[PDB]
Amino acid sequence: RVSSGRDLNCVPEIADTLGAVAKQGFDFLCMPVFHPRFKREFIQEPAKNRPGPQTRSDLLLSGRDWNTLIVGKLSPWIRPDSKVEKIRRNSEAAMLQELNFGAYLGLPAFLLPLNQEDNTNLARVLTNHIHTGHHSSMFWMRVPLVAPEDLRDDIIENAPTTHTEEYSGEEKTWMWWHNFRTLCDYSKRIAVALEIGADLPSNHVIDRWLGEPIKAAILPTSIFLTNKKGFPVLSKMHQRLIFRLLKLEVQFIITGTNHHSEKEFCSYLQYLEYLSQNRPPPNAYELFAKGYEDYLQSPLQPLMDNLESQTYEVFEKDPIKYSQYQQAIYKCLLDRVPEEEKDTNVQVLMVLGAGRGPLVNASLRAAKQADRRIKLYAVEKNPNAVVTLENWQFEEWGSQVTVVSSDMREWVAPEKADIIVSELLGSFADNELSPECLDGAQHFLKDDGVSIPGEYTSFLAPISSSKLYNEVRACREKDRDPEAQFEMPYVVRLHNFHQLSAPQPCFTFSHPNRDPMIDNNRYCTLEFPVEVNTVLHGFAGYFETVLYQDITLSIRPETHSPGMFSWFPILFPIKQPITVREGQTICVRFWRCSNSKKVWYEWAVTAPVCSAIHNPTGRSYTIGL
Amino acid sequence: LPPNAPACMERQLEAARYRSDGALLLGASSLSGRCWAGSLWLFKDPCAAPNEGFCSAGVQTEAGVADLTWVGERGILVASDSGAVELWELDENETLIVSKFCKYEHDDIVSTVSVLSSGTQAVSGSKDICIKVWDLAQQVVLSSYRAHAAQVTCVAASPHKDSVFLSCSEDNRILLWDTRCPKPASQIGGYLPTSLAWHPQQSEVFVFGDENGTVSLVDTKVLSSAVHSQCVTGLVFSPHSVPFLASLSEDCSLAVLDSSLSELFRSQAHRDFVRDATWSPLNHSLLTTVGWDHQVVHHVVPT
Numbered sequence A: 001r002v003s004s005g006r007d008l009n010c011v012p013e014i015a016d017t018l019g020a021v022a023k024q025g026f027d028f029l030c031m032p033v034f035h036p037r038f039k040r041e042f043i044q045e046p047a048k049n050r051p052g053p054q055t056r057s058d059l060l061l062s063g064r065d066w067n068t069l070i071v072g073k074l075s076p077w078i079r080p081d082s083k084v085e086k087i088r089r090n091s092e093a094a095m096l097q098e099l100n101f102g103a104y105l106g107l108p109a110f111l112l113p114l115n116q117e118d119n120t121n122l123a124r125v126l127t128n129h130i131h132t133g134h135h136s137s138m139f140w141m142r143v144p145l146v147a148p149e150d151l152r153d154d155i156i157e158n159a160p161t162t163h164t165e166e167y168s169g170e171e172k173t174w175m176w177w178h179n180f181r182t183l184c185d186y187s188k189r190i191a192v193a194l195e196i197g198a199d200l201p202s203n204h205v206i207d208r209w210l211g212e213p214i215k216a217a218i219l220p221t222s223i224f225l226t227n228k229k230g231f232p233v234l235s236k237m238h239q240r241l242i243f244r245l246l247k248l249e250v251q252f253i254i255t256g257t258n259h260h261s262e263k264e265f266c267s268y269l270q271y272l273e274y275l276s277q278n279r280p281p282p283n284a285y286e287l288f289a290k291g292y293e294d295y296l297q298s299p300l301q302p303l304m305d306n307l308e309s310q311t312y313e314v315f316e317k318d319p320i321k322y323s324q325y326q327q328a329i330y331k332c333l334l335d336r337v338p339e340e341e342k343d344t345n346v347q348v349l350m351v352l353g354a355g356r357g358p359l360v361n362a363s364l365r366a367a368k369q370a371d372r373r374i375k376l377y378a379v380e381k382n383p384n385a386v387v388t389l390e391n392w393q394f395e396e397w398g399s400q401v402t403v404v405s406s407d408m409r410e411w412v413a414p415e416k417a418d419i420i421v422s423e424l425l426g427s428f429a430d431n432e433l434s435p436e437c438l439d440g441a442q443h444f445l446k447d448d449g450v451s452i453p454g455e456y457t458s459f460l461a462p463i464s465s466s467k468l469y470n471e472v473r474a475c476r477e478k479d480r481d482p483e484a485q486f487e488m489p490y491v492v493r494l495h496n497f498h499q500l501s502a503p504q505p506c507f508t509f510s511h512p513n514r515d516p517m518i519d520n521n522r523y524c525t526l527e528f529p530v531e532v533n534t535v536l537h538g539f540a541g542y543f544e545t546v547l548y549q550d551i552t553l554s555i556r557p558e559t560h561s562p563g564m565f566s567w568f569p570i571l572f573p574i575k576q577p578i579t580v581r582e583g584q585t586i587c588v589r590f591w592r593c594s595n596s597k598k599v600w601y602e603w604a605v606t607a608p609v610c611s612a613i614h615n616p617t618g619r620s621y622t623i624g625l
Numbered sequence B: 001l002p003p004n005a006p007a008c009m010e011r012q013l014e015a016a017r018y019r020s021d022g023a024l025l026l027g028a029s030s031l032s033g034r035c036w037a038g039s040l041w042l043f044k045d046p047c048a049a050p051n052e053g054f055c056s057a058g059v060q061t062e063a064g065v066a067d068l069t070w071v072g073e074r075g076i077l078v079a080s081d082s083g084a085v086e087l088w089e090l091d092e093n094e095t096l097i098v099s100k101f102c103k104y105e106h107d108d109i110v111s112t113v114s115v116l117s118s119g120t121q122a123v124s125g126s127k128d129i130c131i132k133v134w135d136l137a138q139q140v141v142l143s144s145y146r147a148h149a150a151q152v153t154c155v156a157a158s159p160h161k162d163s164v165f166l167s168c169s170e171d172n173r174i175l176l177w178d179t180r181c182p183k184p185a186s187q188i189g190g191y192l193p194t195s196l197a198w199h200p201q202q203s204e205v206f207v208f209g210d211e212n213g214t215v216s217l218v219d220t221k222v223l224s225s226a227v228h229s230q231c232v233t234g235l236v237f238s239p240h241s242v243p244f245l246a247s248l249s250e251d252c253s254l255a256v257l258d259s260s261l262s263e264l265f266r267s268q269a270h271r272d273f274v275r276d277a278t279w280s281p282l283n284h285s286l287l288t289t290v291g292w293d294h295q296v297v298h299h300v301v302p303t
């Protein structure tokens, strides 16, 4: 249920030691590749000519083992940022030597410590290694939640621990990591092995780290409490954090010696296993989303692309959406039809972008439950989908036509309509061009007609995520602008991210658009209060819509419709990450632009510092009309 | 010709310590090869060491010897990589060596260990940044101190007061300690400290060596001279009335100095790191050193 290995700094017999660990229930072993006290001279004789083998033979395990069961640890004496030159040099050599052995063996990962503030020459040695030969060992930076300095015992008489609350001075180990990964231009091979101490920081720090590439959590034996029966356990505060990490699907590393002696050493693991067993099992949405975690995709364009049969099939499996649509139509019918007109007056209902007919079925269902009479039209421009409709029409209908294949902007209605129903909404509401499509169709709506949906509104929120930043980076393609990938929205189930301020509304559209001119372009300025220091990597997009009166759908996280998987968050990246300091405001500006042929978004950051305007003139991203 | 001892002693010689009667103690780890462990040896004849065949007793430790010391005359206090402190004692005949205890208490390699003047207590320092005090009689830790913010490089008990000791660390702090204060530690004002020696005739004075090969002199109630090209690993004062200062470094050299730190001896006899020194009780011009080149050397020091 949970993947977890064992940290050791002492391995007399690699054969037997790996076996003991396996007996305990562990899945891998973080160990040293050279003896951690075996210190080596690369330059001054005589020590440089130390004879014999520098470490134990690679023959000591299967390549399989090396590839799967072992994690390398950089010897603790290696200090590439030493103030002493000779050390700095022997360190440069030693490090490359150890990392090169780690590559030779095909180690899955290798541990390096961030345990002081200046790791500049260490970053740089590792950057050369990464660009030397061909190898894909992962690099796990051991960084503490709290500096060893900031949880020393207050027992130096003449050097006391600060009893003040320092906001930056207890955030300091994140700047260490930030500075290191920044120097390595965010290499996707460099991740975080986050070490947990007995004291935790404030929850702001804990929010910070999620959104950083944590591949490993490290729990010292020393932080474990004991229960009635004398067994290892953790505080409610430490557990809540473990639960938070399990959600990120990290790996767990038990380090240090056996402090609960009478109770064995495989017991710590069992507590982790126990915790994993006892958390709420995933909901429908969460079960459905498993796999799609932080997976960037292009947002669908049903206006200028014909959707696949199986694309339609999955959207039809959405429980809540069509239930909401049905209900919305039912209320509308009641409001429009008095009881004494039950059979004299029959409503003219038009589904626009009717697809394979899920909104048609909703209308039928509504008609019955409201006990009112309707005359149904189905308008569909996707001919591949029209085949589905006409087969069903032919097999189960024969009542006139109206499965009429046409573009709703093109179509000439035989009569004006009471109600027009559409499911043209995107993850950013107006980004499938619902506005432009319905403005075309508006003329055949009755002077007192109702559109479902009646109105929708898009929402943005600034986000910090070094994982998503890299994901976008890796969308760089040949034969196009090298920074094109930063100038387009992605649909994505955001997972490893941090939301820096609450969502606020961007653009709103009402239907029908009663007034003249009816310009569909917009420019809108938004300001976000930022509670921590952070790094801005882009903006989440969500939406809500009013189908009819109190009937709504919403992907806004706070008001999210329960178990509705038809839409996922959208993402607006920014080319260059913008550092934010606690208390600052983040000011973003968004434009909706259009011409005859295409509609697009431009956006910019104006505070605290300015960004370049993104996607000017839809040069990287457009939506086809 | 070894009795219950091992066939071959590990190549990396770590410690060398004469006792009252002029017998030599040897700690060894193997820091490269299939098998990463450690061994202990008594040489009733110093001159035969390190000959496995010509030893008095020897034994295998589960893992590596980072440091040891004597505990009176029958006792050996050891710092395993395992994170354990081990107490071994010689049998009545002085021909076996037997694990009295081996408690796994540090969360990492135990790197240093000094016996307090009482003899009934010792203090060890580790890479887990924790200093602990042991009662050897009861085989338990009385107190554990996280004074430091980095690896504990070296700890040295007061020769006289049995509640005082020095400690130094990668975090660049030298600490003077008194167990009798509610806050038992005191910082004492560049390059990191690496070795600690108390002066034997002043409760008040001690020498430290830095990672840069400078030896320094201090009484809490600074004089220095750069002795070495690489880090000072070790500092042991001779037994003489006005006593000499043996210093040893990763530069594979041994110096002996006078009270003003003026150099009176030199030996690149060693061809790998020099890891210990210990002066004889039966002779005070006999200095013995051991290093990772496997050489027990017996220097004659002019005075």
Ligand SMILES: NC1N=CNC2C1C=CN2[C@@H]1O[C@H](COc2ccc3cccnc3c2)[C@@H](O)[C@H]1O
Binding pocket: A300, A302, A303, A307, A315, A352, A353, A354, A355, A356, A379, A380, A381, A382, A385, A406, A407, A408, A409, A423, A424, A425, A426, A427, A432, A437, A566, A567
């Ligand atoms: N101008 C137009 N004239 C006629 N028909 C039009 C049109 C524009 C689009 N259509 C049709 O509308 C349907 C879109 O349906 C969904 C279904 C599920 C979705 C889930 C998430 C997001 N968006 C979704 C959109 C398609 O059948 C397409 O042909």
